[PDB]
Amino acid sequence: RKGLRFGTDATGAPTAELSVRNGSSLQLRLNDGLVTSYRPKVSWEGGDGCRELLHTVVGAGAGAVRGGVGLVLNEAASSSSSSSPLLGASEWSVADVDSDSYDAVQVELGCVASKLEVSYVVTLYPLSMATAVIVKNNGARPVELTAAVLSHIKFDKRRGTAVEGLRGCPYCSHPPPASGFALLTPAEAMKREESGWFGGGGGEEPRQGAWTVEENLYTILKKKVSRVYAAPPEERKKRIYNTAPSKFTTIDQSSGLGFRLVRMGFEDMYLGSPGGMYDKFGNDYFLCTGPASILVPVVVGPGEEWRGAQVIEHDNL
Amino acid sequence: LFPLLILLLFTLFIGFIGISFDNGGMDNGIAELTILSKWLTPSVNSYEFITNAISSVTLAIFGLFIAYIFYGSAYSFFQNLDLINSFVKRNPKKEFLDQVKKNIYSWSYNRGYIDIFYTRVFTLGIRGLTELTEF
Amino acid sequence: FAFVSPRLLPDGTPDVHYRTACGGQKLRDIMLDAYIDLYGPYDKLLLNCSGGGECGTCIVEVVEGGEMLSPKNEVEKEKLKRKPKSWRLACQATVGNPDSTGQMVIQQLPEWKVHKWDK
Amino acid sequence: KGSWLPGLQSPAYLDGSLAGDNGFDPLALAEDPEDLRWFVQAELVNGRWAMLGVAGMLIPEVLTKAGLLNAPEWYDAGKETYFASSSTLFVIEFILFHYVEIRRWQDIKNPGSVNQDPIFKSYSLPPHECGYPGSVFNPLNFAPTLENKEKELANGRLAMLAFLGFLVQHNVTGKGPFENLQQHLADPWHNTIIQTI
Amino acid sequence: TITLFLGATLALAQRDIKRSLAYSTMSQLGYMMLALGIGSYQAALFHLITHAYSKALLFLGSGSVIHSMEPLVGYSPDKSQNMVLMGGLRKYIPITRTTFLWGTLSLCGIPPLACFWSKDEILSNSWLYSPFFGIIASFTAGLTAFYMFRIYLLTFGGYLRVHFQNYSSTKESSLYSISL
Ligand code: CLA
Ligand SMILES: CCCCCCCCCCCCCCCC(=O)OC[C@H](CO[C@@H]1O[C@H](CS(=O)(=O)O)[C@@H](O)[C@H](O)[C@H]1O)OC(=O)CCCCCCCCCCCCCCC
Ligand SMILES: CC(/C=C/C=C(C)/C=C/[C@@]12O[C@]1(C)C[C@@H](O)CC2(C)C)=C\C=C\C=C(C)\C=C\C=C(C)\C=C\[C@@]12O[C@]1(C)C[C@@H](O)CC2(C)C
Ligand code: SF4
């Protein structure tokens, strides 16, 4: 194969241990876009850093029911509200790997010939991994999409786990459920997010928002604590100057680590967490959160391009 | 770093000079146990002193606590942040409180105006007195 | 609606934020309405804060819509020796209450930016 | 792991799999694996019964000198008069122990053989780990994890040491060790092994 | 009891470590000057003995912190020694951090450490004299515990606000995002 500063390996499926001259390394699967693990250097004493994604165990055969970054793209079918037709179950072609040094590596997957031309770019910097999508389309009529990343981060104890930095968004407490949003989960993330403990916020389709909840968020009332945090669906996202929402941040009061989740070109943020039906998915805590553009259909055009990129910085050396 | 360490060794042992007034602290250790070593000076524990020290350390921990609330980080476990998540939501007197800020800082940056006083009085008084005794 | 547009805390391409504001107040309060950060890495309690005063830790850089602000004071002329003519203090400065049809673009705190490399 | 000598390399005998490994064999006794197992079991049992014994020494002494109770010294308890004479309880001890310990040894020779109570066929036993028996011994469902075996073995080693100390100090003195502690606290310099010779 | 409270209420919001330390030591000498004014100087001398070391340690630690961070920011006072662009150093220089903490806690007043058994005695004697400034002494004994820990939390816990990727981007930007 080809490789400069890593090895295109195989364990059940083709993978790659993207590495840098700092210790940080991500274990990306080639069978799909589902990154499996990402080990930065968080602390100084201890040789390296270890605070990865929540990577569930192998299941049937090759398993893969793990989640963790898996890009979930779809097509907003112009037939019904069926925003879950397909990921375009097809091949995947690696191309034009580059490093530029021994502290940066990025792979470029490609998938064509059934849907439009989809390009996927996964980058690893000395600190921050990143995922970007290109959705180049042309043909009979403009087609649509959802373009969601999930990125199920791992958190410490589910009793001291929360998020800062939003504090202001319309928060659109309406979740289209069963995958967070954007069905066709990366072969698994979570299923049928519901709440039956006590009175939860939102009439399931408000924009109650006007957030003004203070510095923290205290995400503990979970298994359905999941809500798009973007601007409301055209009630204010219609006219000029429609109050761009935000960029993210995280907290875990029991370890002392931070992981900023910057979005670029996407539209929303799916802060979603378990903590209810949790004793079936491990021990400590986790939650799915990432950007996308799904709150409205995403008509792109007959010969145009889409863009979207999540970046996971930590700035916590 | 050597002097820092050796002086850290001092900032903990020196408290044993006037250690306490309740049987000293040990029945052995003949090295001036309950004869507290400030004998160079001229020529259970007391309940009142106990409660006085309790009030002192209470104000101390209260100051430390407000300091940790305002400046301390959040990634630790000693900023509950539930209350912090409340005393921004229903903050009643923010319209008034900030003005107090607008005062207090405006003072400390002005260095305790008494400093400017000697400037606009003394070193501007003699500067004219010299001119007068010249003319 | 003195439509404002923030160029926030230099990021990769831009880092723009949008905000609809009814003129009449100062820049400080109108920013602290749209929740966008102004006081750099300066925290609540006492560190260089409290509005309309001395320290001068809010140095917003105005790019578009400059001909809609109050004129410069002399405290601005004093605490900004280092300034290029562009930016001001924004803590003793106001937008006109009658300018409801303005269009102003602002870059936030300088000295933490690498820009004018753009446009 | 924690080689008790910051410069010496640990021998291949004690890798670190077994709990409490520190390469503490300057005489190369257990360099044969089966003998290593033997001494593992021996250390386990010695430490458990040493913990038992040191408790039965210390706690009664302090509870008597506290005025809450009244019970003779562990050495002064033999000549004491009970509901049962010495020989009776001794032979009962002998028969019961010749049952229990021989079952233990049969388990040692054969992993998973003597499991069931051969009286009734249910209620018997879940398969165990050698040196760490099954259900009827750990009723509170404690998970036999690491930092439990290590704490056990460390406490047991120190208990062995403390028991040997009790014995030799009774030899040289014949007095209650807590009284030795009180005399010590009086003046550690005037009260030590030096003066009593 | 005038210079005590005055030095106390000027260490607030003073963002220069080698200046706030001076304000703190003046507010501390206020206590000695008060204690002498009631006859029980046998505790004033003890308080002075404690405060000497408990402040010299802090000054030396501040010098070390300045010279440690001085290569990152320009060679300039008020560009260094200004603990608002500094802040968070527990990870980078431990041996000169534990000393700062165990000195500033002693100065704040905690039973096991020093500078405690002295100011407690002099506060007791002050209250025994008269509440008129006993209450002022008692209040400053908490205001000091506030700002002495304000300094430490400002300049020893955080993300090194110079670089924490929200305001300044000087770590990694030219990293060639999604390619041609
Ligand atoms: C748990 C272990 C332990 C403890 C707490 C003590 C404690 C004590 N022993 Mg002792 N002792 C021990 C084990 C222990 N011993 C062992 C194993 C032996 C046999 C070698 C002896 C033999 C011995 C004699 C012959 C005498 C004492 C005496 C004493 C008392 C005075 C101290 C002294 O003279 O030096 C103790 C002398 C020793 C030889 C002890 C050596 C113990 C070895 C080095 C291991 C202990 C290391 C341990 C980590 C450090 C202490 C731990 C402690 C701080 C918790 C004191 C209460 C004296 C006494 O009762 O007079 C008041 C006395 O005459 N001991
Ligand atoms: C409890 C109630 C209390 C009430 C108040 C009591 C106050 C008593 C003390 C008065 C204050 C003293 C502050 C000194 C500050 C200082 O040293 O400034 C430094 C300047 C430096 O000069 C200047 O120095 C300049 C450099 S620089 O600016 O200083 O850096 C230089 O450029 C310039 O040429 C030069 O002129 O010094 C002066 O200009 C004047 C010095 C002060 C002269 C005092 C004379 C004696 C006063 C006695 C008062 C008695 C009152 C009772 C009478 C019955
Ligand atoms: C100390 C000890 C063993 C120590 C062995 C050691 C350190 C060996 C170390 C080495 O091998 C290694 C590690 C490696 C080699 O290269 C080096 C050496 C050095 C060779 C065992 C004690 C073991 C001590 C034990 C088992 C004590 C048990 C006590 C009991 C049961 C008490 C019972 C009573 O107290 C009651 C219950 C009631 C009372 O009234 C009556 C009685 C009967 C007195
Ligand atoms: S006015 Fe001067 S002091 Fe008041 S906030 Fe703006 S900058 Fe800080």
Side-chain angles (χ1 to χ4, degrees), chain A residues 1-43 45-47 49-115 117-121 123-134 136-144 146-172 175-213 215-217 219-221 223-224 226 229-265 267-284 286-292 294-314 316-317, chain B residues 1 3-6 8-18 24-25 29 31 42 44-78 83-88 92-95 97-98 100-101 103-109 111-113 116-135, chain C residues 2 6 10 12-14 16-36 38-42 46-47 49 51-53 55-60 62-63 65-66 69-82 84-88 90-93 96 98 102 104-107 109-119, chain D residues 2-12 14-50 52-99 101-157 159-171 173-182 184-190 192-197, chain E residues 1-31 33-35 37-54 56-78 80-85 87-92 94-142 144-166 168-170 173-174 176:
Chain A
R1 288 92 173 94
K2 79 190 82 86
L4 309 192
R5 307 306 297 155
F6 63 89
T8 55
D9 205 305
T11 176
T15 186
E17 313 100 358
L18 279 74
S19 297
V20 291
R21 57 151 53 79
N22 221 324
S24 309
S25 88
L26 70 91
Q27 199 152 346
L28 177 139
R29 138 175 297 166
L30 272 297
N31 206 340
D32 201 354
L34 177 50
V35 173
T36 73
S37 180
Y38 172 90
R39 58 196 298 275
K41 182 176 174 66
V42 193
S43 69
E45 287 205 41
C50 183
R51 191 69 193 140
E52 289 65 27
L53 304 170
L54 182 83
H55 193 275
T56 72
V57 303
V58 63
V65 282
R66 50 199 56 187
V69 80
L71 170 70
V72 52
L73 186 92
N74 291 301
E75 186 150 291
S78 310
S79 60
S80 299
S81 88
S82 178
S83 165
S84 195
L86 46 82
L87 277 160
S90 308
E91 52 277 10
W92 274 114
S93 158
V94 56
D96 57 27
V97 63
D98 177 80
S99 43
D100 178 79
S101 161
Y102 192 45
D103 68 345
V105 280
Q106 50 91 8
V107 183
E108 183 158 317
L109 278 299
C111 167
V112 298
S114 88
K115 314 179 295 197
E117 166 152 356
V118 175
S119 316
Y120 182 106
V121 160
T123 78
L124 177 43
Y125 309 150
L127 301 165
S128 302
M129 80 185 278
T131 292
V133 194
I134 300 102
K136 189 266 181 181
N137 165 42
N138 181 47
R141 68 184 181 272
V143 298
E144 295 87 349
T146 48
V149 306
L150 306 179
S151 89
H152 325 311
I153 315 188
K154 186 175 176 62
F155 280 167
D156 211 357
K157 274 186 78 194
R158 181 255 188 283
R159 67 181 294 274
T161 64
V163 160
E164 79 169 355
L166 276 190
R167 197 251 193 277
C169 274
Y171 160 72
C172 203
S179 52
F181 298 6
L183 214 67
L184 265 295
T185 179
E188 186 176 1
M190 185 72 77
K191 272 317 209 288
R192 303 313 297 119
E193 294 168 345
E194 290 184 351
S195 195
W197 288 264
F198 288 104
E204 287 280 327
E205 278 87 37
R207 276 82 58 216
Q208 59 184 358
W211 186 248
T212 63
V213 192
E215 182 270 331
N216 262 18
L217 294 180
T219 46
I220 48 181
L221 298 175
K223 174 63 167 153
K224 208 198 171 59
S226 160
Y229 269 88
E234 200 92 14
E235 298 85 8
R236 305 289 298 283
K237 205 183 175 200
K238 184 186 301 187
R239 63 211 65 169
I240 57 178
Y241 283 120
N242 59 348
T243 56
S246 287
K247 75 181 180 182
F248 211 58
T249 313
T250 56
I251 285 176
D252 52 334
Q253 311 185 1
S254 277
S255 178
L257 316 183
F259 302 104
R260 146 177 290 101
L261 264 60
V262 158
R263 85 186 179 196
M264 293 160 163
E267 192 262 8
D268 47 29
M269 300 282 209
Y270 315 130
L271 179 64
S273 166
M277 301 326 140
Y278 178 52
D279 310 336
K280 331 164 170 63
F281 290 84
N283 284 340
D284 283 30
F286 80 98
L287 53 79
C288 75
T289 311
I294 206 174
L295 200 50
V296 290
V298 199
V299 285
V300 58
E304 304 214 86
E305 319 163 2
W306 172 260
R307 185 77 209 285
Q310 159 204 25
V311 168
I312 297 96
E313 298 173 342
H314 63 87
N316 195 359
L317 265 163
Chain B
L1 279 70
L4 279 169
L5 296 200
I6 300 159
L8 195 157
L9 268 294
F10 282 118
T11 179
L12 319 176
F13 164 73
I14 207 62
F16 290 169
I17 284 298
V44 301
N45 182 279
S46 316
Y47 299 88
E48 199 151 2
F49 171 56
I50 281 174
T51 43
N52 214 309
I54 293 299
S55 78
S56 87
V57 307
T58 312
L59 290 174
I61 183 64
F62 206 76
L64 202 166
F65 179 44
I66 46 176
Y68 197 86
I69 291 171
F70 282 162
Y71 297 87
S73 171
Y75 295 80
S76 66
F77 187 73
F78 275 4
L83 72 163
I84 296 311
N85 208 45
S86 64
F87 294 97
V88 174
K93 290 198 295 314
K94 275 276 179 211
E95 69 288 353
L97 287 149
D98 59 344
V100 169
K101 285 159 176 157
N103 261 6
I104 179 66
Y105 181 48
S106 69
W107 198 34
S108 159
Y109 169 74
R111 207 188 281 289
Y113 284 107
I116 294 174
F117 192 50
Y118 303 153
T119 288
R120 207 183 285 173
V121 172
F122 280 65
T123 178
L124 271 189
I126 314 289
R127 274 195 176 151
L129 206 58
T130 61
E131 162 266 343
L132 195 142
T133 180
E134 265 184 1
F135 287 166
Chain C
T13 46
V16 288
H17 275 172
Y18 279 134
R19 37 168 160 161
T20 316
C22 61
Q25 320 88 309
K26 317 295 181 54
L27 265 188
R28 174 175 191 251
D29 291 331
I30 202 56
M31 276 182 175
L32 303 190
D33 179 283
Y35 297 109
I36 68 167
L38 169 52
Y39 290 122
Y42 293 74
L46 271 301
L47 227 49
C49 63
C55 72
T57 182
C58 52
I59 320 295
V60 313
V62 52
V63 292
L69 292 88
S70 298
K72 291 182 181 179
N73 274 40
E74 88 298 337
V75 283
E76 306 181 29
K77 300 288 185 182
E78 204 273 345
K79 290 272 187 38
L80 270 75
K81 298 285 97 176
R82 92 192 59 86
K85 323 296 297 292
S86 315
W87 56 70
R88 297 175 64 238
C91 48
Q92 290 177 335
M104 198 165 50
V105 177
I106 280 175
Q107 181 173 43
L109 201 77
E111 316 161 319
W112 316 82
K113 73 175 183 52
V114 279
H115 277 332
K116 302 303 106 178
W117 181 247
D118 285 343
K119 280 84 183 179
Chain D
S3 67
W4 66 272
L5 298 173
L8 184 57
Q9 62 288 349
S10 197
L14 322 173
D15 61 351
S17 46
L18 312 95
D21 169 28
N22 307 85
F24 203 110
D25 186 4
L27 295 170
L29 293 86
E31 297 298 327
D32 216 9
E34 71 276 17
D35 197 6
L36 180 51
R37 294 182 24 191
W38 191 264
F39 295 150
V40 169
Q41 304 295 331
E43 189 183 4
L44 263 288
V45 55
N46 278 286
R48 295 194 168 107
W49 295 91
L52 265 296
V54 60
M57 313 298 215
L58 196 57
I59 300 300
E61 183 174 1
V62 295
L63 289 175
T64 62
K65 304 311 289 183
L68 287 66
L69 298 177
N70 47 306
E73 309 292 336
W74 55 273
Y75 53 94
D76 288 333
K79 61 178 61 176
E80 202 278 334
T81 41
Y82 309 82
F83 87 102
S85 43
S86 72
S87 316
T88 311
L89 52 87
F90 183 78
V91 308
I92 306 170
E93 188 170 320
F94 174 84
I95 175 62
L96 260 50
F97 262 97
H98 198 283
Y99 180 70
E101 290 270 344
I102 207 64
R103 277 188 87 115
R104 180 175 73 100
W105 185 52
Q106 189 47 46
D107 179 272
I108 289 307
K109 286 186 294 172
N110 195 344
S113 65
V114 65
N115 301 117
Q116 62 272 43
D117 294 353
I119 320 297
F120 305 87
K121 308 319 288 175
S122 90
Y123 158 68
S124 317
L125 182 142
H128 71 77
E129 172 59 273
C130 48
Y132 309 97
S135 177
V136 77
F137 304 86
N138 54 5
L140 277 74
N141 196 25
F142 286 162
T145 174
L146 290 174
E147 201 211 359
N148 258 316
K149 296 186 180 185
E150 295 187 19
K151 283 184 194 169
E152 178 164 6
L153 278 182
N155 276 292
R157 290 165 177 176
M160 302 186 206
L161 205 168
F163 171 78
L164 186 48
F166 280 166
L167 212 50
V168 304
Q169 289 169 264
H170 182 259
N171 169 30
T173 62
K175 313 179 182 182
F178 189 75
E179 311 154 7
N180 313 342
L181 274 192
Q182 300 164 259
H184 193 136
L185 188 148
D187 188 291
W189 293 102
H190 300 151
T192 176
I193 184 179
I194 289 89
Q195 303 98 11
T196 176
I197 312 190
Chain E
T1 74
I2 284 167
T3 189
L4 178 147
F5 159 81
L6 178 59
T9 181
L10 278 198
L12 272 295
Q14 196 66 280
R15 62 182 182 193
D16 277 352
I17 176 166
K18 214 191 286 196
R19 183 80 46 76
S20 180
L21 267 295
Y23 276 125
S24 169
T25 188
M26 154 171 42
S27 171
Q28 275 296 331
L29 269 291
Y31 274 104
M33 196 67 54
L34 156 61
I38 59 167
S40 178
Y41 82 108
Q42 178 245 307
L45 291 178
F46 182 63
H47 180 286
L48 185 141
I49 293 170
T50 72
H51 165 265
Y53 309 106
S54 164
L57 190 145
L58 284 167
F59 286 108
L60 296 192
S62 45
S64 158
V65 174
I66 298 175
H67 285 282
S68 46
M69 74 174 294
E70 210 166 7
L72 281 178
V73 182
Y75 278 169
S76 196
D78 308 86
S80 66
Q81 84 168 13
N82 168 39
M83 79 294 286
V84 63
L85 57 96
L89 268 73
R90 54 188 213 286
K91 188 93 75 173
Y92 306 158
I95 299 93
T96 187
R97 169 248 180 174
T98 43
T99 174
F100 206 96
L101 165 76
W102 274 351
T104 194
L105 284 182
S106 182
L107 184 60
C108 277
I110 309 280
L113 280 72
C115 199
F116 164 93
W117 291 291
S118 88
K119 65 177 174 64
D120 300 332
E121 173 71 27
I122 78 171
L123 281 160
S124 71
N125 299 130
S126 178
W127 268 354
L128 263 291
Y129 178 84
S130 178
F132 196 17
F133 40 74
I135 181 173
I136 287 309
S138 157
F139 190 40
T140 306
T144 48
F146 164 73
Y147 71 81
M148 273 324 292
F149 212 73
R150 150 161 187 282
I151 293 181
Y152 171 90
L153 284 194
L154 213 48
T155 187
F156 274 92
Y159 283 68
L160 189 50
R161 279 83 59 85
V162 168
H163 294 297
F164 77 118
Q165 284 185 334
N166 304 355
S168 171
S169 45
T170 62
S173 88
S174 80
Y176 78 102

